[PDB]
Design a protein around this ligand. Structure first.
Ligand code: CL
Length: 154
């Protein structure tokens, strides 16, 4: 696994664990995240996607970059964090991914996608993340996101 991606994944785990107060819950969401990513990766490697699905994958990446850039913008003291906006963007990502894998992955895998995106798009979690107690976590996530965008890994 890519080192920067691992660093961000680590931070997402830590944010989830601290927000929920549950190691088992955080481990579960990150396990599902990893499973989903790899399953989608395999579909890309095996040439399983049709033309409309490949266009959907392109849209998903655009949306994911938009989410990342918006997360970064809200990190600026200048601009006011709006949880509903970031949550809405993450839900747009969820929905594009769900469409992408509708005909390729099992309903169980669709459930894992909903679990991951619904966990992190939770306005409660995001509000905590952008609040006074999560300053260090947010900085590290933003550093990672900026590096991923810079290196073309999103
Ligand atoms: Cl298709």
């Amino acid at each position: 696994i890519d080192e920067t991606s691992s660093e961000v994944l680590d931070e997402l785990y830590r944010v989830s664990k601290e927000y929920t107060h549950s190691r088992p819950q955080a481990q579960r969401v990150i396990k599902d995240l990893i499973k989903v990513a790899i399953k989608v990766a395999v579909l890309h490697r095996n040439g399983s996607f049709g033309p409309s699905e490949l266009a959907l994958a392109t849209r998903f990446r655009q949306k994911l970059r938009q989410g990342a850039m918006t997360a970064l913008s809200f990190g600026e003291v200048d601009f006011t964090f709006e949880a509903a906006v970031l949550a809405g963007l993450l839900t747009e990502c969820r929905d594009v991914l769900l469409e992408l894998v509708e005909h390729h992955l099992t309903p169980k895998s669709h459930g894992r996608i909903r679990h991951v995106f619904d966990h992190f798009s939770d306005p409660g979690l995001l509000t905590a993340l952008y609040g006074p107690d999560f300053t260090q976590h947010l900085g590290k996530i933003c550093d990672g996101l900026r590096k991923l965008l810079d290196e073309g890994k999103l």
